[PDB]
Design a protein around this ligand. Structure first.
Ligand SMILES: *[C@@H](O)[C@H](CC(=O)O)NC(=O)[C@@H](CC(=O)NCCn1c(C)nc2ccccc21)C(C)C
Lengths: 88, 162
């Protein structure tokens, strides 16, 4: 009756910036991290999975604008693809 | 929010997909914690649309979505401790945690943080509540943690010559 499970599995953190560094948030338009996350979640939600989609948004920040920040994915323990089938 | 029919997906890296649960009997849950007023440090103007956008996004995505705002690191663990127990997890295929605060090197900060008055939820802690131990309805079931907060004071950058 007593079996074992991993204590840590299936996670994924996504932050706004790398360590040591800052996150921007514009007064009338929210966090530039939030905006961009949302935008990408909409279009790629089931073209792609969450590892992919979180890659893409990282890509969209790459050549520094004036208010640069690189999103990072800490501590992913996803074992499988998280496809997010919007509408099922 | 763009939509469906692509069975290509269930025939790719499949059975390394996460098993999704039918749309009729789901009780999906998601948590937004977002702080805007702080006792001592600059008010987070613009944080609303963070809350909005994300709550609509999540909802759109198939999620009942709780907002709580303006918390200490205390009420962060205690509320989050509660999100762990919610029995809708048993009939859920996943969850989405999001935090939105100021932040320091170590962690997300709460209502009262200054350098003499420190208030920090470690990213460690978010994980230690939401695992197989403290949140057992969620094993073999994905959980994403979305942290909008500053990680420290430095701007993003190094110079290079062209
Ligand atoms: C972290 O402590 C927070 C980010 C958070 O809410 O998670 N950082 C800040 O609030 C910064 C202030 C800030 O982002 N200021 C926005 C400045 N700004 C303006 C006026 N127009 C912009 C367009 C695009 C990006 C930023 C813009 C810190 C640096 C105090």
């Amino acid at each position: 009756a007593i079996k074992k499970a991993h204590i840590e599995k299936d996670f994924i953190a996504f932050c706004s910036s790398t360590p040591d560094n800052v996150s921007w948030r514009h007064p009338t338009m929210g966090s530039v991290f939030i905006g961009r996350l949302i935008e990408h979640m909409q279009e790629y939600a089931c073209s792609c999975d969450v590892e992919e989609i979180f890659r893409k948004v990282r890509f969209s920040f790459e050549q520094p604008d004036g208010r640069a920040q690189m999103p990072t994915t800490e501590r992913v323990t996803l074992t499988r693809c998280f496809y997010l089938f919007p509408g099922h | 929010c763009s939509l469906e029919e692509a069975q290509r997906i269930w025939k790719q890296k499949s059975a390394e997909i996460y098993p999704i649960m039918d749309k009729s009997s789901r009780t999906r849950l998601a948590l937004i914690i977002c702080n805007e007023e702080f006792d001592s440090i600059p008010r987070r103007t613009g944080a609303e649309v963070d809350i909005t956008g994300m709550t609509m996004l999540l909802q759109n995505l198939g999620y009942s979505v709780d907002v709580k705002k303006n918390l200490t690191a205390s009420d962060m663990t205690t509320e989050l401790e509660a999100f762990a127990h919610r029995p809708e997890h048993k009939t859920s295929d996943s969850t989405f945690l999001v935090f939105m605060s100021h932040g320091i090197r170590e962690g997300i900060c709460g209502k009262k943080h200054s350098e003499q008055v420190p208030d920090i939820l470690q990213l460690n802690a978010i994980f230690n509540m939401l695992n197989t131990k403290n949140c057992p309805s969620l094993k073999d079931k994905p959980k994403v943690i979305i942290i909008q907060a500053c990680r420290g004071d430095s701007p993003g950058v190094v110079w290079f010559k062209d």
